[PDB]
Structures are given as structure tokens and as C-alpha cells.
């Protein structure tokens, strides 16, 4: 049975849609040629990081009043330290063909993102906004801007750089920001005003890595694609555009995107929109969330680490350790180690010494007077 | 039949291969995900793109 | 075995070694590709963090002012200068008698300014306010 | 003045107020530049690990490392630091470099 | 999900 | 590129090409409040060839 091709009109071939729903849907088993899109969002984290707090949630997506202290040193509080936002999406397991030593992982192709809530900035009538002049309207949200987002299969690799090492950031006490002092274990040295390779940290928590001190390390982030922007000014205007047609491609120069290690999609973003000028003259930053529509596909890969080496490397650590006399390292208790293979004609010197050159070829040592 | 891929399963034990973070709620009662779509193969074009089942 | 039975995976360049400057001593074949990730600190006249006293102003300059009377006698700390460096690369030719020699060629450079995210600090303890009771003036 | 030329010999000793890249003589090199004046004008910057810059010339050849050495030079001034007293001071930031190299026969 | 084994 | 729609550049008549330029960079705010313009030179690397006409 089949319909008449002439009697029946033809239509286009759009990609077939299997399912549309929430997070509980990713569990669906899909073929090797399937494609996944995830629409999600991240609220900003700028010191006031929770609306559930009964006392101080009036300033969610805001900071407390920013002021220079006036006397060294500086002691800023967490509520004045806006930090990056981050989240992880757990992806389902996939097949593997151990016979060919190849498995398959998720990769990201494209992300469709846009800053949400831009329309809310035209509110020039917040009851405490500083009038630009007498009998006038409010000073629109403007000034400093910082925008970045990062997509990768690993947590984003960061770099530490602070405008002044004299500042003393709050200590990490089971909560609170994490600063270079927390990573190194020492007070910040004036090297940190420049680039210090010692000051590096993976982005592991939300709202705990302030933007003032951390910046994306360009060296290590090879498995992540991050984009940035900034403008600094007293009351310079903020400009933003938005649409749902602009998409961004994440493939590299070699044709691969970020590979989700641990079947986890790592996302990080941060968007400052400007100041909130108050009648008191006091000032405070502000932010607003970000929209993400990451597209994912299935890519086959070859296991780089052969399983056998992992097995022994695993149980050895699990097996009870053995604290014997040192047999490796600086104080090894080993004197000679010889290695034989095959038969050769008898050489003259029985005290001969041979080794392998830096190029892997066989070499015979010519004896020399040891000083 | 072993339902679990061995390599993916064993790599979970290694830290650098399975990184974990304390990110925003993206799973459960407070999931910050609005929609998820799965595409496989091609079909004849449907009228409504926002199909309601 | 079983070539056709195995799935097909893409072909990417083969990573042969990864490490620090130590790697530059390593030789390699003719059709090789090397890639160097490095950095350079800014020399704003205050050019060393190790000095005892004046290092507090690293990556900065002393207070710039016009003298108000000719001539101008500026100190080095108000003269920001370029930042230069050279990296040593390994030799490529053991024989010179060969009609053709080979040298290192650079094709693409990936650059980025480090530490941009720090500029939002508008609360330096001595930073001038934009207005009374306001916040400090950002780096501009 | 053509007589006022020199080579970027050392670091922290060739001021920016005085020296500028001589366009005529920098043949085996590739340089890029930017500037903005203004007392309190905003500073804008962008960054990504996707922006690579091709160094090849119009004839299809890049810079050749004479003397088995790669020469790199950079300078980035970010802006002022308005102190409460009224004083003003410049500031700079480092740069990242990910040079890609190969072997050409000559 | 690998996260669920823990 | 100096070529026009017809793939023809400027023809150096009189066995010589002519160059003209002008670049101002801004004012010089003197302490007395007075002002004065300022300019910078230009480097030119004209590439040119022979054509039959
Ligand atoms: Ca790297
Ligand atoms: Ca020339």
C-alpha cells in the first residue's frame, strides 16, 4: 500500500522531532545520529546570591553600596564582590565498542545565547534613583559593564589578577569568596598585580570566585570556548542587542567542539549592566540572567588511556601501601640494573656499559677518565 | 548484557576525568532548564513547531 | 581487527609532546608543528615586583603632573615602555653542505589581554569618587 | 627624522612617548596597534580563545625566526587611576601569546 | 547518569 | 588597492606619481587655556607596475 505520488503533494524534509520536555527527558535512549538541544538559564550572582533569605533579599541581582574606604587597607565584604555564575548539566551515558577501543562522547556544536531582561533597564522611576537634575527623571542604569560566557566539557580554568594586593579579602570560612590567598596559602605578593602562574584555580563553585580578582586563563582553557566584553566608565551608556536568529558555532579549527568529560556540560556566565544611582549619591552594581540553547551531538572517540593501565594504577592506590626502604628517587638503594636481549659475539671489555641515546638508538659507551 | 560502558564507568573514579562543581540548580525540584528537544532523522514538515502532545 | 566493523573516528593532528620550555630542547621531524604559549608582564616604568619599597606600585606609574615650568625633567617611573622578550629555539640543520637549509616560520598567533576582569574594582581605598558619597572612578 | 631610528633591544627602557614602530624597516615582522586619547573616556576590551590571527604575508610566507629566535613585543596601557588627592597614574596589563610555528625550507 | 552512582 | 572598476590604477603621467596627505590629531590644551592643533606624518609604501597604453 502506498499513496498516489501524483495525486498527493510533496512537502519539505525537516529534522524529525522525537520528544520535547524537561530535564527528565534526557534519559531517552537515542541513536548514534541523534542531536540534543538544551534550553536553560543562569541567574546572576553579585554578592546577594539568594532571594530565599528573609532579611537581605531585597537586593537580589545587586550589590551593597560601593565606596572607597579612605584609609589603607581595603576590607571589602562578600556583598560587594560580584562573582561568576556556573552550573553543570549531567548528560546520560552512551555506548562503547571496546573491541575497537572506541567510545562515544557528547560534544557541543552551537550555542544560541542572549541576555534576558534587557527591557527592564528603561525603568528610570525607581523611587530612590538620583535625579540627573532638579525636577528631572532618574539616571538610567549605566556605567561599568562586564559580559562573558563560557561553554566547555571541563570547569573553566581561571587566572588570578587583582588591582591591588594591599586589599584584604574576607577569609574562606565554610562559605564566602575564594581569593588568591585561599589558593596559594600566603598573603598576596605584589607579583599578583601582574601575571602570576602560581595564582590559578578551576571554577568549582558558584558566587564564590569574584570577578575583580579572577580572569579566564587563556593557556589552559583549550577544552572550552569563552567570549568576553567590557566597558568602564562613570555613567557611560550601556548598549545591548538581542535576537533569536544569531547563533554561535563552537567547532574548532580542527572540526571538533568541546567534549563533555564525565558526561557533564559545564557553563559559566557573568553580565554586569551598570550602576544604580541612588539619591544618597551611593552606587551599586547590577546584573541580570543569561539564556543558553546549547546544541549537542554524539561523537565517537578513541580511548586515549588504555584500560589496563588504569586498572593497575587504581587498585595499587586502593591496595594497602608498602612503606619499605627507599628503592626509588634521590636515595634509591639500587646500584646497577642490567638488561639483556638476544645473543651477540663476545665483546672484549666485560665491564662494558651501554645505554639508549636521546633518539632511542642503541649506543655503546666509550670509557673516559672519571676526573 | 553489561548495560554500563566500562571506560566511562571507571573514569568516574579519576578526579581530572570526572570533574564536579557546586553549580546552580540544574537538576531536580529547582531545575533551571526550560526545555529539552531531541532530534533524530528527518520527517515531513509538521505545521505546528510547538507540538503539544 | 575488523576494520569495517569498527566505527569511523575523525583524524586530528597527533600530539607528540606537551610540557614547559624543557620541550624546546627536543628535536623533531620535518613535517612537525610546534606551538608556544607564553606571556609578558607590563613594564610601566615600575618594572619589578622584587624591590622592597617602590614595588607597591607595580604595573603602575608615579603621579603624572605637568611641571608648570620649562623644561620637562620626567623621571623614569613616569615613562612607560614596551615589553620585549626572546625565546630560544633549537637548531634545525646538522649539515650545511646541503643545497637547502630550513628555518622556523611563524604562521598564526593567538593573543589576549590577561586580567581584564580586574578593572571593575571601583573601591580602591584612595580612589577618587565620581561624586560625594558615590563610588570610585573606574579605570578609564 | 630618519636618523632617529633604533631596534627594540631591551625591556623597560624604550619609552612609548618617544618610540613608534618604524613602518618602513619592519619587514620581517608583523605588528598591530591601537590607541585612544581622552581624559576620562571609557576603555573597551574584548577577548576570546577563538580569535586567531594569521601572520602570513601577501606572498604566503610568515616571519622567519632568524638566529633560531622568536622575537615578541607588546605594550598595553589600560588607563588612569584617579586618586582622591587628584593625582593620576597609568596602568597596564599583561598579554597572552600562543604562537604557532613550522619548518620552511630555504 | 554517572553522578547518580555516588 | 588602487585599481578601479575597470582594473586600471592611476596612470603616472609625466613619469611621476603625486602624493598628498594631511593628518590632524587634536588640540594641545595649554595651561593658560589656549589651544593649538597638531599633526603627524604618514608612511607610504606605494606598489606600482608598468602598463601598455
Ligand atoms: Ca594550553
Ligand atoms: Ca620595507
Amino acid at each position: 500500500c502506498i499513496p498516489k505520488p501524483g495525486c498527493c503533494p510533496n512537502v519539505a524534509s525537516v529534522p524529525k522531532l522525537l520528544v520535547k520536555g524537561g530535564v527528565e527527558v534526557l534519559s531517552v535512549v537515542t541513536g548514534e545520529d541523534s542531536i540534543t538541544q538544551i534550553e536553560l538559564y543562569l541567574n546572576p550572582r553579585m554578592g546577594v546570591n539568594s532571594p530565599d533569605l528573609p532579611t537581605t533579599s531585597n537586593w537580589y541581582t545587586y550589590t551593597y553600596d560601593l565606596q572607597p574606604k579612605g584609609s589603607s587597607p581595603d576590607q571589602p565584604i562578600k556583598e560587594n564582590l560580584p562573582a561568576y555564575s556556573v552550573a553543570r548539566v549531567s548528560l546520560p551515558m552512551l555506548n562503547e565498542d571496546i573491541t575497537c577501543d572506541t567510545l562515544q562522547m557528547w560534544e557541543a556544536i552551537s550555542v544560541k545565547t542572549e541576555v534576558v531582561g534587557i527591557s527592564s533597564l528603561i525603568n528610570v522611576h525607581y523611587w530612590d534613583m538620583k535625579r540627573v537634575h532638579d525636577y528631572g527623571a532618574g539616571i538610567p542604569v549605566s556605567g561599568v559593564n562586564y559580559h562573558m560566557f563560557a561553554i566547555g566539557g571541563e570547569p573553566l580554568d581561571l587566572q588570578g589578577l587583582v588591582l591591588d594586593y594591599q586589599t584584604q579579602y574576607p577569609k574562606t570560612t565554610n562559605g564566602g569568596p575564594i581569593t588568591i590567598e585561599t589558593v596559594l596559602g600566603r598573603k598576596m605578593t605584589p607579583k599578583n598585580q601582574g601575571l602570576d602562574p602560581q595564582a590559578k584555580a578551576k571554577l568549582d563553585k558558584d558566587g564564590n570566585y569574584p570577578i575583580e580578582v579572577w580572569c579566564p586563563d587563556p593557556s589552559k582553557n583549550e577544552n572550552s570556548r569563552y567570549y568576553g566584553s567590557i566597558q568602564t566608565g562613570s555613567q557611560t551608556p550601556t548598549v545591548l542587542q538581542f535576537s533569536n536568529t544569531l547563533t554561535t558555532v563552537l567547532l574548532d579549527e580542527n572540526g571538533v567542539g568541546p567534549l563533555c568529560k564525565g558526561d557533564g556540560l559545564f557553563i559559566s556566565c557573568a553580565d554586569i549592566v551598570g550602576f544604580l544611582f541612588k539619591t544618597s549619591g551611593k552606587m551599586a552594581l547590577h546584573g541580570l540572567p543569561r539564556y543558553f540553547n546549547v546544541t549537542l551531538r554524539k561523537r565517537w572517540v578513541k580511548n586515549p588511556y588504555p584500560v589496563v593501565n588504569l586498572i593497575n594504577s587504581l587498585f595499587s592506590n586502593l591496595m594497602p601501601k608498602v612503606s619499605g626502604q627507599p628503592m626509588e628517587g634521590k636515595d634509591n638503594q639500587v646500584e646497577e640494573v642490567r638488561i639483556y636481549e638476544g645473543s651477540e659475539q663476545l665483546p672484549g671489555d666485560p665491564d662494558i656499559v651501554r645505554f639508549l641515546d636521546k633518539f632511542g638508538q642503541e649506543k655503546t659507551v666509550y670509557p673516559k677518565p672519571s676526573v
Side-chain angles (χ1 to χ4, degrees), chain A residues 1 3 5-13 15-31 34-77 79-95 97-170 172-173 175-186 188-190 192-203 206-219 221-301 303-317 320 322-329 331-357 359-360 362 364-367 369-370:
Chain A
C1 181
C7 294
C8 195
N10 58 5
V11 298
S13 298
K16 185 173 177 66
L17 177 62
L18 291 178
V19 61
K20 179 176 72 69
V23 179
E24 296 83 4
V25 177
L26 281 74
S27 298
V28 173
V29 176
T30 62
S34 67
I35 296 170
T36 300
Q37 291 182 357
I38 298 170
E39 314 198 18
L40 57 89
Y41 66 93
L42 279 75
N43 288 318
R45 296 290 184 267
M46 291 180 181
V48 179
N49 299 321
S50 178
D52 294 331
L53 296 176
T55 62
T56 184
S57 295
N58 297 115
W59 296 101
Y60 188 70
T61 66
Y62 285 97
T63 64
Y64 284 168
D65 296 331
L66 293 174
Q67 292 179 357
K69 186 175 181 180
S71 66
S72 177
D74 190 358
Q75 293 179 355
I77 62 172
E79 291 81 2
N80 294 118
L81 296 175
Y84 292 101
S85 297
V86 66
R88 181 180 183 271
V89 174
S90 180
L91 297 176
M93 293 184 287
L94 279 74
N95 298 115
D97 189 359
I98 191 166
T99 63
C100 296
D101 196 1
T102 58
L103 63 92
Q104 59 183 358
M105 294 175 70
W106 293 100
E107 83 167 331
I109 298 169
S110 66
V111 63
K112 185 184 287 185
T113 175
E114 107 175 31
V115 191
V116 65
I118 298 171
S119 67
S120 66
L121 294 175
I122 64 170
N123 188 358
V124 299
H125 57 84
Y126 171 74
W127 63 270
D128 199 1
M129 287 176 69
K130 180 175 174 65
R131 291 177 181 267
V132 62
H133 64 275
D134 291 331
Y135 293 101
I139 297 169
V141 175
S142 65
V144 177
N145 289 320
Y146 182 76
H147 296 285
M148 66 84 69
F149 66 93
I151 303 300
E154 294 178 353
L156 184 61
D157 293 331
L158 274 66
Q159 179 68 44
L161 190 149
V162 66
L163 188 64
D164 187 1
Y165 76 98
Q166 294 293 109
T167 62
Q168 291 181 356
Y169 291 94
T172 301
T173 61
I178 296 171
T179 311
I180 300 169
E181 293 179 354
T182 303
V183 176
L184 295 177
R186 72 188 72 184
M188 289 186 286
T189 183
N192 298 118
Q193 292 180 357
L195 185 56
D196 189 358
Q198 297 293 320
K200 293 182 184 293
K202 292 183 182 292
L203 201 155
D206 183 0
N208 291 318
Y209 290 170
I211 301 169
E212 295 182 355
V213 298
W214 295 107
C215 66
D217 187 358
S219 48
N221 285 313
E222 9 263 358
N223 195 4
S224 295
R225 275 68 174 171
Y226 66 97
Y227 301 96
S229 176
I230 190 167
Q231 70 178 1
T232 68
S234 65
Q235 61 182 358
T236 61
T238 187
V239 294
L240 292 173
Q241 62 273 17
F242 60 93
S243 176
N244 60 3
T245 61
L246 294 174
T247 186
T248 300
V249 177
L250 280 73
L251 293 175
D252 62 354
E253 62 185 1
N254 290 319
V256 300
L259 297 175
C260 294
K261 288 174 71 175
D263 292 333
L265 183 61
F266 291 98
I267 293 170
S268 298
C269 69
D271 288 328
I272 299 170
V273 299
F275 292 102
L276 183 61
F277 294 94
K278 294 180 183 179
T279 60
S280 298
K282 293 180 181 180
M283 294 172 69
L285 290 173
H286 177 67
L288 44 82
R290 190 66 173 269
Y291 173 76
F292 287 147
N293 192 357
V294 177
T295 301
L296 296 172
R297 68 179 174 182
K298 295 180 180 179
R299 177 181 286 274
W300 290 99
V301 294
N303 185 2
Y305 298 97
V307 177
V308 177
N309 293 322
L310 280 71
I311 301 296
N312 299 114
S313 178
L314 193 151
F315 291 99
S316 65
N317 204 164
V322 178
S323 178
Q325 291 182 358
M327 197 62 70
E328 66 182 2
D331 290 332
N332 55 2
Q333 294 179 356
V334 62
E335 311 189 328
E336 280 165 64
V337 160
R338 302 151 88 89
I339 294 171
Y340 295 100
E341 181 178 0
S343 67
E344 69 178 0
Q345 293 181 356
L346 178 61
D349 188 358
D351 292 329
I352 190 168
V353 55
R354 294 180 182 176
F355 70 95
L356 293 175
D357 59 358
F359 297 166
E362 185 69 28
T364 301
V365 177
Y366 184 75
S370 65

